[PDB]
Amino acid sequence: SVRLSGYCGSPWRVIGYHVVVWMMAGIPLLLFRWKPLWGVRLRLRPCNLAHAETLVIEIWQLFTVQVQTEVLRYYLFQGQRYIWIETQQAFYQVSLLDHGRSCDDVHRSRHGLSLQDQMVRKAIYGPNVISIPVKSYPQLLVDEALNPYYGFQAFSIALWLADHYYWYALCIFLISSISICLSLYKTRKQSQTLRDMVKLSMRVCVCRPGGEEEWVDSSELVPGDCLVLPQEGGLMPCDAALVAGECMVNESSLTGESIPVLKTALPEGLGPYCAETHRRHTLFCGTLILQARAYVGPHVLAVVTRTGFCTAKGGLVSSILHPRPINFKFYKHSMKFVAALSVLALLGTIYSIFILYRNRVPLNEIVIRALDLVTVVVPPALPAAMTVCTLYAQSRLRRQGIFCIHPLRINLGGKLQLVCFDKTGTLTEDGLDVMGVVPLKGQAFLPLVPEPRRLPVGPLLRALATCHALSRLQDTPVGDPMDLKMVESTGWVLEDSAFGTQVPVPVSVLHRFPFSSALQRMSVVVAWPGATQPEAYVKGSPELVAGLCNPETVPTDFAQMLQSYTAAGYRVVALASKPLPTVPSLEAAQQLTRDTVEGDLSLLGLLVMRNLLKPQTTPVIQALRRTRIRAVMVTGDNLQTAVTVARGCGMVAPQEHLIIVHATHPERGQPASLEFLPMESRSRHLALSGPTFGIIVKHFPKLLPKVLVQGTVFARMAPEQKTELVCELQKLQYCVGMCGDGANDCGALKAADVGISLSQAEASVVSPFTSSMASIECVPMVIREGRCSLDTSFSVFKYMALYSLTQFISVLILYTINTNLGDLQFLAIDLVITTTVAVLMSRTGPALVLGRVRPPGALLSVPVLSSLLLQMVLVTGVQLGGYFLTLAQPWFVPLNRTVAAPDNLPNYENTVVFSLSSFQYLILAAAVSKGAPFRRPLYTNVPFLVALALLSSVLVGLVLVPGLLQGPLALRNITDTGFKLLLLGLVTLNFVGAFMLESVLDQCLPACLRRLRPKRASKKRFKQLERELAEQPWPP
Ligand SMILES: CC(C)CCC[C@@H](C)[C@H]1CC[C@H]2[C@@H]3CC=C4C[C@@H](OC(=O)CCC(=O)O)CC[C@]4(C)[C@H]3CC[C@]12C
Ligand SMILES: CC(C)CCC[C@@H](C)[C@H]1CC[C@H]2[C@@H]3CC=C4C[C@@H](OC(=O)CCC(=O)O)CC[C@]4(C)[C@H]3CC[C@]12C
Ligand SMILES: Nc1ncnc2c1ncn2[C@@H]1O[C@H](COP(=O)(O)OP(=O)(O)O)[C@@H](O)[C@H]1O
Ligand code: ALF
Ligand SMILES: [Mg+2]
Ligand SMILES: [Mg+2]
């Protein structure tokens, strides 16, 4: 649901808003950007929608859109025009302006669009350009700089400059600049990807009315404008309908299917035009026209129906630009965790104020120093660390050959609990192998003919040779792999469309109804010289086609034979025919209605084909099942073939059970019924067809969750059924991933949390994730790298927390004795050590093998909190131990209490504390960087390892080598060498202790937690169902 809110312009209120929110404070701006409804209400008065000058959009999320004027006024929301419909006093999307006009209306527009009407319509529909705005670099800098985080960083810069800490201010500025530049790089790279995806600049001639023509730019097109297509072909600039002609088009960009598709002229009729119903008659935007020819007339004509963002390409681009929010929140209790850190920060700030009062510090300086302490705990480099983490993850995936359009989905990839796989072309090879054809002799099957070439010239051989959608492209047939192999098996050569016998008269294809996955069948109308009348051949699902055949033509053995070939793993389609009493000619034969042809056939035979499992499929499936990630197969193929492939690919290990759920339709006199018939060779899976799934969803919503939880093979699923299944699974709190290659999986890939399409280009739009490899190996890679990304982000957050608390502790310890860290010591710690380490942590790659244990989801969990508190206890212990150990030395000289830092620097206390803390930052970075089970070991990150080694060596030099940077850093020299070695020993003790503590926690904490407060259950619906089924299996 949506709603508008119009606010007519008023300058007095605007200036009042400006003065109030500028003079008062920035807090009103903060809460306005948090709650903008108040801001808009204050800025201007609600007004009549017709008089509206600004609109607020609720979908609640509030968006503000200016109502532009061009006599005609409109407004763009998410790239969608809405014009001012004067008669209805409302804003209707331009998508609906011409909607509903009949096919005959399109054929009337066929001739062209009047130039005056063209310019009248260009304003309404706008230029035919999917435009991704190209923001100027200053505009982007404004986009990022206005972040309140960078506002606080600028406040810190000012505060430190006021205190004469110039190097620290420079450090803050440099880190903020690095963060801003990394954000710029991220945004610019994403925008460049999209922009380069949706480039289009070409000149297309338009059949202007009156019979003449005109060469216009592709951006001048408007719905109803007439396209004349180039005979040799070219990129299609806008969605259109084929009024006249036939077109071969490559829809790979739009759907990822590289096989050329056949496009035909729109059929005249008094019914509404629809890009979905008439998809076969409509060219799409961004698809390549391989070659089109005109059956009648000098040139092929098409009529534009959708331009700009209205197009399907435009719809996908808009969905990318404004993605649906990710429902999962990766870092649970993030606010509560930052609050548990802020309580410590506030306690320390109060303690700092108390001590500074105790030391009799002037109130002008007490507030300044407490404010400085406040600025300490905000890490300048946190945004840079996060953005670098995401960039490294994306780069790793791209190097592996997997491209993600929304990098935020990478984290989701590691949270997958269920993966749905298309069977054909994803688990099994794209190619087929004709094992033979099973002809019929009356009402009984004959022995399999392994070589169809030897079939006598008759209905079956002509059906094999002719029932398909092949097209000769550059003297090479192209089309469905099944059609290619079927035709090749017969030896007939493609040359409407005619076929030449292998060596027996050539046969013409008068008319052809293409294959639709929803219909899961396909037919043609055929005639040859000497034919009394044309014959229509149908080729589709064996069980569906057998329904169209006359009951006396289908053998009583049909089910058993089809299962004999299907239960062996073959891919079977049936061929049926019926003589058409129409006179053989394109005139009548081209006017046939598909339904008139499909019904009342006469089964001819079964075409058995051998589709093989990909070599890489079984290892991947077994790896997925080893880590308790449910593997589900959603396919449109036969149920027995699907089950055999599942048993062969490890989705059903031999020991495990399998039960076929079969649902009977609610025929008259009885309701729908569920019957479970187990088939002999967690531990129990279910298999069910598509009609059975629909019956279960409609009539057994109570048992539907139990079917979904333990259902593994979903066969004979239509594309809408695949999308519905994905949605239903997601309703069980599953994190569903879908790995399908075909175009019939577009809906599932959109709906799935993680959608992967296998055979794609360097980049694409079809699905969130796209790969270049033909195997399903991308699924384990995506899951592994998503787990690595989650662990890396958690480790970076933990390190920044530890990094902050350590600096906080150091500064508190130094305040307690009336001194500070130092001008250049702050720079060193924040930039040379911490930024380097934080940006190098994330470069480490993912673990090579998936593991059963999932990455943690909560930042506030007892493990993480205990780790942080124990680490900080060790850090404070080490720093205070060093501080109290230096006081014990005979050569110790206490700092000058009276003068305050940086005046009292250098001194022994600051020197010792700085040395220990500087080592501790590297120690903590090494401690938090866990390798297993989600990442590679630390040492495989050669940049990060080298950074640690070099920084540690430099710090040891500072401690040991006299005079090294002891002036620039304001470090006091410690003549005693035994105490230097004692400081190094304390540092080594901390280095060992942090790692031992981390290991002890990560090993013995989960066991103690389980044995202490075991979880009664899990909020996940599917986990509840799993436990319930274990308690009581649903099928007895
Ligand atoms: C004062 C000194 C000691 C501070 C040193 C800081 C550097 C270690 C940091 C600052 C920003 C970091 C960069 C920020 C992010 C990236 C992006 C990354 O490159 C890509 O992601 C592109 C790959 C592709 O095309 O897919 C390489 C590392 C790099 C440049 C980082 C390398 C390390 C950098 C230069
Ligand atoms: C005070 C003086 C005497 C010492 C100053 C030391 C720093 C300037 C050095 C120590 C380690 C150096 C870092 C060591 C490793 C690298 C990795 C390098 O990036 C890569 O290695 C990416 C390579 C790839 O992607 O193939 C960026 C610079 C950086 C962080 C160096 C930046 C400068 C650092 C922090
Ligand atoms: N060119 C074609 N013409 C007619 N039917 C086909 C063709 N190719 C495949 N089929 C049939 O369509 C049905 C469903 O196809 P689809 O939805 O793509 O799933 P899959 O092809 O993976 O089995 C299959 O059972 C198959 O027999
Ligand atoms: F195997 Al499929 F749609 F390609 F079910
Ligand atoms: Mg497929
Ligand atoms: Mg198919």
Question: What topology does this entry show?
Answer:
Blueprint: H1 11-23, H2 27-34, H3 36-43, E1 54-57, E2 63-66, E3 68-69, E4 73-77, E5 80-85, E6 90-93, H4 103-109, H5 115-125, H6 137-145, H7 148-162, H8 166-197, E7 203-206, E8 214-217, E9 226-229, E10 239-244, E11 246-250, H9 252-255, E12 261-264, E13 282-283, E14 288-293, E15 300-306, H10 312-321, H11 334-358, H12 363-376, H13 382-400, E16 402-404, H14 409-413, E17 418-421, H15 423-427, E18 434-439, H16 459-466, E19 471-472, E20 477-478, H17 481-490, E21 493-494, E22 497-500, E23 507-516, E24 521-527, E25 535-540, H18 542-548, H19 558-566, E26 571-579, H20 586-589, H21 594-598, E27 602-609, H22 617-626, E28 630-634, H23 639-648, E29 657-664, E30 673-678, E31 684-688, H24 690-699, H25 704-710, E32 711-714, H26 719-730, E33 736-739, H27 746-751, E34 754-757, E35 769-771, H28 778-815, H29 823-841, H30 862-887, H31 908-928, H32 942-960, H33 978-1012, H34 1021-1031
This protein binds cholesterol hemisuccinate (2 copies), adenosine-5'-diphosphate (ADP), tetrafluoroaluminate ion and magnesium ion (MG) (2 copies).
Report on this structure.
It is a single chain. With 1036 residues, this protein is of the alpha+beta class. The protein folds into five domains: 1-97, no CATH class; 204-321, Calcium-transporting ATPase, cytoplasmic transduction domain A (Distorted Sandwich), CATH 2.70.150.10; 334-401 and 782-1012, Calcium-transporting ATPase, transmembrane domain (Up-down Bundle); 412-428 and 613-772, HAD superfamily/HAD-like (Rossmann fold), CATH 3.40.50; 434-609, Calcium-transporting ATPase, cytoplasmic domain N (3-Layer(aba) Sandwich), CATH 3.40.1110. Strands 16-35-34-33-17-28-32-31-29-30 form a ten-stranded mixed beta sheet, sandwiched between helices. An eight-stranded antiparallel beta sheet has the order 18-27-26-25-24-23-22-21, with helices on both faces. Strand 4 (73-77) and strand 5 (80-85) form a beta hairpin. It binds cholesterol hemisuccinate (2 copies), adenosine-5'-diphosphate, tetrafluoroaluminate ion and magnesium ion (2 copies). One cholesterol hemisuccinate (Y01) binds next to helix 29 and helix 32. The active site is at 422 (4-aspartylphosphate intermediate). Pfam families: E1-E2_ATPase, P5-ATPase.
